[PDB]
Amino acid sequence: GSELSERIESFVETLKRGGGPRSSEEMARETLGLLRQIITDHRWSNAGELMELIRREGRRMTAAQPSETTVGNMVRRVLKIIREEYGRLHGHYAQLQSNIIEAINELLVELEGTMENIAAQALEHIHSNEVIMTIGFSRTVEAFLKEAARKRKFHVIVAECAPFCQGHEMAVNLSKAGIETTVMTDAAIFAVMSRVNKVIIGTKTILANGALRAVTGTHTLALAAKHHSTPLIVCAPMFKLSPQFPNEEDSFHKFVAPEEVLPFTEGDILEKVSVHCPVFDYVPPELITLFISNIGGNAPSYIYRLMSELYHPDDHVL
Template structure:
């Protein structure tokens, strides 16, 4: 199911993530049928590991109330997704302090909610890289300015020059990969590299449903990335150049985990090295190759 979705929508990693979360919910309700709510997790049961999986259930038998249980679990998952941004924003005061200078890039609704949550009780300044050629950073800057947050828009080329004045870098992401790296908006890699050079901590705001059990394969850019029209970079009006150059306009960057200091999700903060544990709790090993 996840593989077919990825073939239909290359680069749509969230299709795979949601497919795997659904399978985990279905398998959990299927395995726990007929047992009480205090049953142990079969995956973590030493007894089950020693038995070597010799006992099998007859899956041809009808399962009472399975449909209702799965639907209820899906509603709980959807509710968690809807409340994830507010849960992340509630942690803002623990990470943003008065008179700090925060740098971000692009427009992430989660980061916007996070900054607005801190602005209710703290005064700070935000520097927003405009994220050319999409210029999503301008939209974020406008929304923050309307919320009475002191905001400055800069070009992407000015990120390194201003990084020495910054206290924290806070960004969002499209997907958190299995190794703790990011599939983030183009320009995020350069931003985090500049932050590391100046020893500025990088915080990533990402809900749990953005965690993926997939790793980046350097040769699999067609699946990982999304290449869009280069018209915004080199328009057809430049007719004398169009026939002489081949322009790639990728939407996403891969950010290695060693450039990230902290993940803030709807369940709290974690280091990139802990992502593997969160993924093992979210997904079943049998569903990792969808």
């Protein structure tokens, strides 16, 4: 009844006015739960109206915050599941809901298992007496390093982001487990080159041409890695695959208040100074080497193949 609508506006408002869950896995889980509840307690006598309603809700969620491509992936996966069930049955109208609920539950179980599946492949790409560099705070790279360091010993260098110094928390968490981490600013990135053996970083999402969207300063790291010919492996689960190619996207990066960059107490010079604080950036696909996910490492040229199964081509525009 009204409870579903109330949860819908609450989710939309908490997505729009600010950030939601700290981890993307929880966000995906609650998006799947919201979609399942929408499917359950709604009146729909055929698949077409259900898909239309799901598409409308996905469009509303995307318009709430387009900077994050997490809810839209869940909407597209649900639409693909609906289409697959309809093709299996009609190719009906009686046991569709139970099949949909089962598909949602298995998808949730797989999403829960992605973390362990990714963490299980830590020892293959990491050796002893190696130098690994990470930028920012990521829950996947941290698990990778902590699983790889329980059997070997290496060196990790963590660089924090200038506006949001989230790398300090990552360095503290790693050093609490005995990894011998280092803390340094973004300026000394080219200087620290020529001594790093491997680069392992995360990303917010993966584009269609193999590109990815990550925190600011990742483009400089990729350029330095390409200049020094060091491998660059990105660990990201399967729900970060965005089926949209990189367009012009003048609003690709998220712009926040200039308070983080420049304090409000600067004086009268703030009336004629332009301050911009982008959050994300664009990394060309040619600067990436490997893509580690829950089904195994894959080349950047397998992104379209991986995406084709996940999302139906007609749902790319949603």
